[model samples]
Target: AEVRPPFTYASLIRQAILESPEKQLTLNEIYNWFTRMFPYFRRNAATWKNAVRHNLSLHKYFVRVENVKGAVWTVDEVEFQKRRPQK
Candidate 1:
């Protein structure tokens, strides 16, 4: 039995990119990361994958670059920081 991972889709998406070797990932790679990292995502593929893709497209902090292979996503650290509520 897999417990729900207590992370928002936005945060998980950021984690997937920032934790990568190149600090970037294609959409498919992002999906792979989520499934690999959390069993919850693996079980709930249809729902969570769509949430990941939607958050990447909707969030300004997630920037999509046109790589030679295809579009890859990278996080804008500055934008991400600005979004955090002040301590």
Candidate 2:
């Protein structure tokens, strides 16, 4: 049987961004997707958002862009891949 990979805030954020059409997702969109995808996050949305924001701020690969429309986040595939273990 195959094992399901564990999910982390950083990885999930990366998935959500790269999965987006423009390789970018708004902060609200990220929050919505994160809570929807992870049951744990739905329990305490506030702290989860804070944790998510911390990860986004900590990870160099996850870049945040802001404008009049608010903020949007992006994931750089090459830079993101650097953090993953090579097989």
Task: Compute the lDDT of residue 37 as modeled in candidate 2.
Answer: 73
Q: Give the clashing residue pairs of candidate 2, or none.
A: none
Report the lDDT tens digits of candidate 1 across residue range 6-87. 6666676777787766667777877776677665665657876677667766788888788899978888777877797767
Candidates' lDDT values, in order? 0.73, 0.72
- The whole-model C-alpha lDDT of candidate 2 against the native structure comes to 0.72
How many steric clashes between backbone atoms does each model show? 0, 0
Error of 1 at 67 (Å): 0.8
* Tens digit per residue, CA lDDT, model 2, 1-86: 55345557676676778777657778778677766775556676777677777877788887767757776788877778887886
TM-score of 2: 0.69
Question: What's the CA error at residue 10 for candidate 1, in Å?
Answer: 2.4
Q: lDDT, candidate 1, residue 47?
A: 77
Task: Score every model by TM-score.
Answer: 0.77, 0.69
**Candidate 1 lDDT (Cα, 0 to 1):** 0.73
| lDDT measured at residue 40 in model 2 versus the true structure, 0 to 100 | 58
Give the lowest summed-lDDT range of ten residues in model 1.
Answer: 2-11
